[PDB]
Swiss-Prot record:
InterPro entries: 2Fe-2S_ferredoxin-like_sf, 2Fe-2S_ferredoxin-type, 2Fe2S_fd_BS, Beta-grasp_dom_sf, Fd_pln. It comes from Equisetum arvense (Field horsetail). Residues 2-91 form the 2Fe-2S ferredoxin-type domain. This is Ferredoxin-2. One of its GO terms (biological process) is electron transport chain. [2Fe-2S] cluster binds at C37, C42, C45, C75. Ferredoxins are iron-sulfur proteins that transfer electrons in a wide variety of metabolic reactions. One of its GO terms (molecular function) is metal ion binding. Its cofactor is [2Fe-2S] cluster. Binds 1 [2Fe-2S] cluster. Pfam families: Fer2.
Length: 93
């Protein structure tokens, strides 16, 4: 499985995700994570990837530069490695 660490403003939590699954399913169980559209079309769930890789090609909101800087729509992101993501980042846009 992939090891996912969510670095939230109130602490870090680490959990495993079966390959191919979205991290938000167990993530929302283990932490209070902000969501709105749940479909990759807003920035409510924005996070920043610190290490590892995701597939977030389901998303439509971020521009190429934001993706290149490591921003991630956590509601649709699918890990492709162990990943560390800082959550609650929408105020940086
Ligand atoms: S909740 Fe809208 S993009 Fe994730």
């Amino acid at each position: 499985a992939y090891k996912v660490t969510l670095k939230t403003p109130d602490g870090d939590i680490t959990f495993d995700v079966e390959p191919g699954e979205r991290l938000i399913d167990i993530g929302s169980e283990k932490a209070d994570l902000p969501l709105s559209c749940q479909a990759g079309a807003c920035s409510t769930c924005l996070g920043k990837i610190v290490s590892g890789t995701v597939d977030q090609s389901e998303g439509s909101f971020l521009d190429d530069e934001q993706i290149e800087q490591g921003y991630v729509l956590t509601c649709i992101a699918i890990p492709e490695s162990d990943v560390v993501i800082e959550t609650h980042k929408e105020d940086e846009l």
